[PDB]
RNA sequence: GGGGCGAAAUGGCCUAGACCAUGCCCCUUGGCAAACCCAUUCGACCGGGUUUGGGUCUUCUGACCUCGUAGUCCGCGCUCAGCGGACUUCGACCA
């Protein structure tokens, strides 16, 4: 979670200490993983002995 | 610490030690004002392949202004600043005569009145 | 400042403090040229998690030769250079009578005429 | 609605590889703490509305109360108050 203030130029209240108009916020998540994969091979045969 | 008397003539200004270190050295002047004062900054080192040294001293002072006498609301604020420093190069295998020399003709190029009229009424040296 | 006093048998030298800092104390031999003469370094550290720690002892040395006596001109020329440097890896949590015990075998050793032969006369310590 | 993922649960492809189907991960922000008002057994009764909430001097730049955040030397002494004290910085309705 974050949170940021926004503030404009000398407007509002006839002053000129830029002052805050608004917050802006971003609210998320974070994930660790892991993972494995394997490949493999086989070769195959028949025969019919007799 | 280290203290250093200075004569100006009529009265005697002490500069204390603060910020004592090999490659740096602050001495200050303890008056009144701590910000805004008399600073000076010495810095001793070599060159090259040990052959010879190299000194720097450097020595700052600003004014300082305060309306706090008529005006009702001032705090102590610096004006200008001066910066006056200096390199000594000088190589160890020399000579203590030449040394000795060449310090007595600094002086008297220092004390001499050539360059209190160029810092002064800033008119080139040539007399 | 810090002044080191050594007894060789017959004279006595002084080494005296210059880079007074934490990290690296340069002790200097104040004799005559201050260019190629006794030099020691220390450092003080830690090591790993905050385990152990890790002392280094140096000492340097290098020969100076001149022959303004004779040839009209040469400046004081240094030689060869010396280092003889040391690592201790001494742990906190030990023991004060087995740290004892190692430093006087080490002076033992040290001051044993064996090492001294190896060092003149280089030849393999074996006696 | 806007995004994420092929990971992770399996199915196509399925030395390998990269994509697919259902399929699974989040946002629908939230909180102010005080003071006052109604009709009545002509207050006891829950619910609503208004004024304030770090604060002033020229809250324009910039400073004067306060603190929070750091970096730097620091005192092992000089000053009537004393003291442990210095300088530079960013923030200040709350998660």
Do not use: M
Request: charged share 25%.
């Amino acid at each position: 979670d974050n949170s940021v203030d926004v503030r404009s130029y000398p407007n509002w209240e006839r002053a000129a200490g830029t002052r805050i108009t608004g917050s802006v916020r971003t609210r998320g998540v974070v994930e660790s993983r892991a993972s494995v994969r394997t490949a493999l091979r086989f070769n195959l045969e028949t025969s019919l002995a007799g | 610490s280290k203290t250093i008397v200075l004569s100006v003539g009529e009265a005697t200004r002490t500069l204390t030690e603060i910020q004592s270190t090999a490659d740096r050295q602050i001495f200050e002047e303890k008056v009144g004002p701590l910000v805004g004062r008399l600073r000076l900054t010495a810095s001793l080192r070599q060159n090259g392949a040990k052959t010879a040294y190299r000194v720097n001293l450097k020595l700052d002072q600003a004014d300082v202004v305060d309306c706090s006498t008529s005006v009702c609301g001032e705090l102590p604020k610096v004006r200008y600043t001066q910066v006056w420093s200096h390199d000594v190069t000088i190589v160890a295998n020399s000579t203590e005569a030449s040394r000795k020399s060449l310090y007595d003709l600094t002086k008297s190029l220092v004390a001499t009145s050539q360059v209190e009229d160029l810092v002064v009424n800033l008119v080139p040296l040539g007399r």
